[PDB]
Design a protein around this ligand. Structure first.
Ligand SMILES: Cc1cc2nc3c(=O)[nH]c(=O)nc-3n(C[C@H](O)[C@H](O)[C@H](O)COP(=O)(O)OP(=O)(O)OC[C@H]3O[C@@H](n4cnc5c(N)ncnc54)[C@H](O)[C@@H]3O)c2cc1C
Ligand SMILES: Cc1cc2nc3c(=O)[nH]c(=O)nc-3n(C[C@H](O)[C@H](O)[C@H](O)COP(=O)(O)OP(=O)(O)OC[C@H]3O[C@@H](n4cnc5c(N)ncnc54)[C@H](O)[C@@H]3O)c2cc1C
Lengths: 461, 458
């Protein structure tokens, strides 16, 4: 956190940089360096809060010239802690949050530091939307570069399936456009290849008209887990793209809609929505709500912005997290029993074992069309441990590790955006050999010195 | 047609985008939410920083261009676009910094409410603002700003601690309780009259999940619902907010199909506090008539903010008449219900709101916001799509307002329509209006900022 810093380079950077600099002696340093995964505590030499593409160019050049370890930060949600470094520079894009939306063209151009809810607000101003993740304060930047999935994905694909171009600052300080017509090698790689290839200062998306959505959330007792999970797995194998249905095994929240004797006990929280006519939606959801006895059932017809803002209603933001995730091509009865066994052991009220079903529009894109791997595996499991007290890290981490080990033979690949700080070696497996090889060649062209290595990293060559 | 060296000085000092009448994106850029207002600016300046705003303000002053300022473009009066002048468009200045420790947010003057609410809510924090996510923070806060958190935490301006503002002479000032407090008084309720606010600083509160209910009552049961509402609100704890919106029932699955498109009371309510207590409180106010299409939920505050309005449709054309009530009498109730029965467009609402609570505890002279002591607000909010039907919808709101004028006083600046320039004095009252004219004579003596509910200097 105290490297040299040639005064002339530094003075060149300062005069070229219009944003804010934050040094270790500054009052806002400690708040500035905190990211969502509170287990990651690192002290950068410097935090540069960029406010424009020229700022990012200055910060990249300054980092390269000074040999500072480069962290890039969009929303700070890295489950691996990638967006803060010890002793280097954080290129922090959090003030670059502008969105321009054309209603006529159904287009959005969004800066690299945007939060999901800010983008959703902007597009919903015109009844428009495009897929992103389900928690409003996640960053658009990291989420999109890894792929990006949420409520609209079965219908409209990953975030990267609606991305048409990026403005990107490469390690040599160049500003490039990448799209289907301009640097398409780079455009393939940023659709899935993370922050490996440079800093994206603007993303352009095609939008869709999305009016109110019929939604339901309910809880089932763990008693009924086998029949609920079998009903879910079997229904989704043939469900219309319009239906999304996700299971979250957790301790029941102390909420008035739930009976007192369920509070704090493991349950299955099922959330579902219908993207399309809300009357059809009401019939479709009613037909999946009764696979177990529903408790705490909430049904609403929501603007899409409000469905985006809904996940997940709790009283405190978890400070500490640890995740282990993989895909499955199929969810066998043995895998289902394992999931339920490990959910009965959840300790924290903030922990969830997520069972997600993608497929739909995500699976109809050709494997090779982007860097995102595993389109053909429909199931995603995520053992997402979350808690508050740092003296309990081992008990929570052990829960995620042991549930994963017990499943791992059934799992393949892994979403880069769900990797934990210890999973740097999962990168080849996540991508597979063919994608990994093509990603390396693009890395050798655009970032041959690996200036961008705080990511699920692809070494060049 | 502009002086070439002035123009060239501006362009040199300006790091944003300029949009000219010949640009393909001009027609989209110049449209505002009130689509009855169709105007053609000489130039649109899309500002990206406080130095850009300084360059635009100085360029307009020097060229003698009429200045429209645009935050979120929600002006009910159409103020955020002009014919022949310059639009200083702040929509790209959307950045927000939140301190969890100090419970503080600094937001730029072009933020939308949903961007602000997302940023605050990442820390479980919030501060009072409007109920529709894509409204502009800029215009809303400068006129006062009320919504779900107001009865508990006051108006938006009651949580504001300082602003950065660019004045008509091109200067950048801080205004707060300790620096330029005459200006700080005026910007809290005096709208965009005193300059372009480029950053707002707010105190925040911790807001976790909120119990919420929305439901629909038949107009058959209208008299007893609205009386139960006016009676209950007179003694309700700050934590309870309850609003009534008379409107055509939206075609949603929670309502039986026979009610769709017929006049109803939509009642929305929330408890800012413990969701168990919230459940008991909302139950106690949900049964004055039979609730149809009841939705009850425990929501993050961000999702409550994103929920309004049921049907989630954007109307193209709008016309509003609003004022305050000190009391809602049985006679005024009958009137409301009679006009409500005549609503034609599925987008129109006759809104009955109840502020009071924390808003009314602030001394009347602490800010430029008038009528803290009148708890009721009615807003005849006509909205429609077809340009050939303007006159019928406009007449609905005018005739309802006329029919209730014996009960109505003042008016919220932020609910004024484009024909209501004459209503400014009655809105503020003599004393406030006179104080505001003196602040205008000091900070905007040439009235460079006159596309607003305008306060002439002197
Ligand atoms: C509460 C929560 C909910 C989530 N829900 C979902 C979900 O529903 N679906 C889903 O797909 N994912 C989800 N995620 C995962 C999210 O996709 C990853 O955590 C993603 O990396 C977050 O991006 P960010 O910008 O917030 O993170 P950061 O930590 O800022 O960055 C993550 C990575 O991206 C790089 N990066 C960030 N922005 C840029 C940019 N503009 N240019 C170049 N590189 C950049 C960083 O260098 C780092 O490698 C969620 C995460 C959280 C914390
Ligand atoms: C659909 C809808 C829902 C609404 N709900 C509510 C609500 O729940 N509560 C409530 O209080 N109000 C509400 N309003 C009204 C809102 O307060 C006013 O329409 C407000 O003026 C909107 O501000 P804006 O920046 O979007 O509008 P704009 O049209 O961009 O501007 C409005 C006025 O403010 C000036 N201005 C805007 N930003 C700045 C700035 N940064 N500096 C200086 N001057 C500026 C403009 O010159 C103009 O006079 C709502 C409006 C709409 C359209």
């Amino acid at each position: 956190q105290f490297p040299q810093l040639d005064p002339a380079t530094l003075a060149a950077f300062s005069a070229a940089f219009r944003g804010e600099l934050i040094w270790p002696s500054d009052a806002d340093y400690d708040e500035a360096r905190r990211i969502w995964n509170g287990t990651i505590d690192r002290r950068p030499a410097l935090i540069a809060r960029c406010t424009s593409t020229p700022d990012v160019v200055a910060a990249v050049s300054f980092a390269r010239k000074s040999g500072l370890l480069v962290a890039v930060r969009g929303g700070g949600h890295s489950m691996a802690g990638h967006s803060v470094c010890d002793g280097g520079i954080v290129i922090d894009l959090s003030l670059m949050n502008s969105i321009k939306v054309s209603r006529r063209l159904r287009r959005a151009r969004a800066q690299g530091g945007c939060l999901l809810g800010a983008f959703d607000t902007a597009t919903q101003a015109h009844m428009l939307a495009t897929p992103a993740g389900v928690v409003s304060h996640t960053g658009l930047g990291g989420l999109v570069l890894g792929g990006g999935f949420g409520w609209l994905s079965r219908k409209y694909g990953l975030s990267i399936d609606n991305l048409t171009s990026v403005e990107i600052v490469t390690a040599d300080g160049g500003v490039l456009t990448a799209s289907d017509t301009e640097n398409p090698d780079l455009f393939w790689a940023v659709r899935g290849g993370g922050g490996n290839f440079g800093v994206v200062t603007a993303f352009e998306f095609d939008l869709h008209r999305v009016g109110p959505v019929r939604f339901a959330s309910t809880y089932y007792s763990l008693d009924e887990g086998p029949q609920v999970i079998r009903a879910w797995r079997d229904h989704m194998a043939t469900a219309p793209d319009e239906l999304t249905w996700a299971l979250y095994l957790r301790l029941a929240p102390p909420l008035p809609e739930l009976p007192a004797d369920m509070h704090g006990k493991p349950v299955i929280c099922a959330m579902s929505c219908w993207i399309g006519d809300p009357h059809e939606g009401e019939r479709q959801l009613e037909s999946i709500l009764h696979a177990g006895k529903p408790h705490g059932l909430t049904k609403a017809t929501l603007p899409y912005r409000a469905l985006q803002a809904y996940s997940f209603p709790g009283a405190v933001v978890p400070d500490r997290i640890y995740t282990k995730s993989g895909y499955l091509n199929e969810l066998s009865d043995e895998a289902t029993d394992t999931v339920l066994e490990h959910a009965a052991d959840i300790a924290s009220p903030f922990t969830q074992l997520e069972l997600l079903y993608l497929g739909g529009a995500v699976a109809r894109v050709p494997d090779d069309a982007t860097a995102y791997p595993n389109r053909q595996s429909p199931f995603v499991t995520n053992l997402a441990a979350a808690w508050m007290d740092p003296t309990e890290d081992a008990r929570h981490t052990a829960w995620a590790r042991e549930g994963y080990r017990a499943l791992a033979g059934h799992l393949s690949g892994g979403y880069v955006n769900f990797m934990n700080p210890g999973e740097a070696d999962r990168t080849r497996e996540a991508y597979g050999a063919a994608k990994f090889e093509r990603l390396q060649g693009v890395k050798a062209k655009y970032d041959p010195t690996n200036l961008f290595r705080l990511n699920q990293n692809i070494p060049p060559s």
